[PDB]
Design a protein around this ligand. Sequence first.
Ligand code: A1IPW
Ligand code: A1IPW
Lengths: 263, 258
Amino acid sequence: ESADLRALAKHLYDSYIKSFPLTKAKARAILTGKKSPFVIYDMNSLMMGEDKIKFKHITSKEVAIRIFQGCQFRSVEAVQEITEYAKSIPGFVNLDLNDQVTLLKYGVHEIIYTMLASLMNKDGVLISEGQGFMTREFLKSLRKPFGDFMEPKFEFAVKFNALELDDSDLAIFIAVIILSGDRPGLLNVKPIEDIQDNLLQALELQLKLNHPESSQLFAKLLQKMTDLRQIVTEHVQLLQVIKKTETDMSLHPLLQEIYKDLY
Amino acid sequence: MESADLRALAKHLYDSYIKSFPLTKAKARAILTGKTTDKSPFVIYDMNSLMMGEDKIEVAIRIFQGCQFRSVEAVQEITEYAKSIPGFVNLDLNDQVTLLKYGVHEIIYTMLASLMNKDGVLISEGQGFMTREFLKSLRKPFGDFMEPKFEFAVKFNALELDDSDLAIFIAVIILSGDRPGLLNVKPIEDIQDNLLQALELQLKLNHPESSQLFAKLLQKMTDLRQIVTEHVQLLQVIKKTETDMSLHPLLQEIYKDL
Ligand SMILES: Cc1ccc2c(c1)c(-c1ccc(C(=O)O)cc1OCc1ccccc1)nn2C(=O)c1c(Cl)cccc1C(F)(F)F
Ligand SMILES: Cc1ccc2c(c1)c(-c1ccc(C(=O)O)cc1OCc1ccccc1)nn2C(=O)c1c(Cl)cccc1C(F)(F)F
């Protein structure tokens, strides 16, 4: 069944390229300087950037809040990209509909963190499909809770990126996260774990072929699921503090409804 | 890196685990499944049976201090086991402390599952059994402090690991290079890689019909991280209400900075 696992890997890779706007391969070429992105490193350059590139999300006048909301806006788009990707995972669309919704609902946060790392290095993050680059130092220097909200994402990414996965590896890894049988409220766990078993087999073979010199990479990647679960838990606690503290967060009730899953 | 060496390592750890830990899973299962007159536990299911049990072998506090006493002993046993893990004692001394400090709680949960089924837990080296319903009915924060241990154990025990599997699994946990404050991660990760290879082959040989058991076991390391986090929090909240609780200096130290 090696050929079947390879077939599965290729299927997911092809779908991953169609679903997501910027691949890790492209993001690394931009970050390493190999079409030069506009750089946001302070308030003035932010203002010029939104006037020149017109980074979508601009509707509170306060910068820190506008950047925070920009993150939420992009994460809503990512949810729809991940949802579409999921539909391409063999067996997924055949699951109970309620279980499809549960899997996506409890998976998307972990997947967004994972894929965010593809767009990050130790110095900052790509935005607008790699047309902009916003510096870590600028994000961290935002006031109040906002600075401290941004920095944990970079800390995770720097560590995740040390595994040096590529898109073909990530396509399978993301699938493994979606098909987690331990999500709350699942109706029929067995078929979910059967599909995950296939994906885990596929990921194992993919990592042995693609990184033969990298010993126990499979195991190291699964251990990252521990850091993912933890940071998502922290994320929720940080969001709640912000919600209780900040009165100037007010959007139109219809935007709030659009963002309800993320805020 | 070569099979025969991986099997040699599995045997080494299993042998050391038997020496370090008084009550194996194999012994616990023979007691729990019964059909043996000699090994039958006295069962504590209420206040009266507790009173008779002390003659034979505040309530919530006494039970709590029972759990705490055993946990301290477990730390001691785990520490002794850790020294047998090849390479561990050769590490920087600060890193040895750090690995134990963050590792013991995860191991205690894991090994406590060996002593549990869905109806209760073995105590007093298997001479006693205390019911889950009795523990959960303890007052105040204490009831809800007991129950999560059982909820984990029921799930972990579904994997049907035996002691030879657990010996390697526990060693993997201890040699975690992602602990906070580690000075030299590389030598830790080198040992862990060896243990992971040993675990993978152990599981393939011992559970050949159990697909991706390796991966499913590593996924349990995630559940451990979260439950230990919740444990610490709940223990802190209890500390602030209850002055009638003392923690052994060893546990006290482990909890300082979590
Ligand atoms: C720097 C940072 C911090 C928190 C962050 C994020 C980035 C992002 C984010 C995620 C996915 C992409 C993607 O292109 O694939 C892009 C993202 O930012 C782009 C961005 C950066 C700066 C200003 C505007 C827009 N999300 N985010 C979150 O806080 C977040 C995360 Cl990691 C997961 C789930 C939900 C959220 C959020 F909704 F609360 F934002
Ligand atoms: C059921 C339960 C709940 C919380 C628990 C525990 C059990 C235990 C515990 C752990 C290891 C053994 C071991 O034989 O190997 C035994 C243990 O109980 C035995 C026991 C049960 C009932 C009455 C008296 C004694 N500890 N425990 C804790 O709350 C605990 C844990 Cl899991 C880890 C560290 C510290 C603690 C404690 F200090 F807070 F107790």
